[PDB]
Design a protein around this ligand. Sequence first.
Ligand SMILES: [Zn+2]
Ligand SMILES: [Zn+2]
Length: 42
Amino acid sequence: NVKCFNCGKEGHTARNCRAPRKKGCWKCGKEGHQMKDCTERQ
DNA sequence: ACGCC
Ligand SMILES: [Zn+2]
Ligand SMILES: [Zn+2]
C-alpha cells in the first residue's frame, strides 16, 4: 500500500495520480530540491 | 511506494 505524494489519496503514487503535481519538494515542500534529494530531517 | 507542467 501507498499514499500519493501529490493529492495524498491511498492506493496510488504521485505518478498514478489524476491531479497535476506540486512544485519544489513533496515531503517537506521546499524548493531547490525534490523529495528524492530532500534530507531536511527536522 | 514516488516527479519533473
Ligand atoms: Zn493522488
Ligand atoms: Zn524536502
